[PDB]
RNA polymerase sigma factor SigA
Amino acid sequence: RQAITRAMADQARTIRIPVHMVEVINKLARVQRQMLQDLGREPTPEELAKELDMTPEKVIEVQKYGREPISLHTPLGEDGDSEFGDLIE
DNA sequence: GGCGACCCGGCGCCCGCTACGGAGTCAACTACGGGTAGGGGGTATCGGGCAACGCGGCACTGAACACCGTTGTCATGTGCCTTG
């Protein structure tokens, strides 16, 4: 499990995330999932911040850092021929 | 045992442009240890603002000469009157 999780942290995401940011983001994600499961509603950012014990600015920071790129070579969907990489200047 | 079908894969394409919708995603943890990165603290080095001098144009110094220009000046020449 150690080797597998190290590999997932260090080689899964297109934009590399440090291992301890990786555990921070997965911790906040799983606990937020628990918040949704308990309260049955999207938790407010301040409540999440206190649950994580960090301040809201770190919450927003890791939330924004925990994304993944979208591929240009995808159909635009407006038309089959068109692709996303041919619409951004 | 090369022919033979047939079989199968395997591939290759599948009119033109504009113009025309949106979007966005399920499964660890903590301990250490370093190294860097930032913070303020303090310090040597470079840059911007004022006083003394030098010029430079012209300007005054007119003073001292020069340039016409003027009415000073005049010993010396025409015109009338008196006498040979």
User: Anything to note?
Assistant: The longest helix of chain A spans residues 19-39.
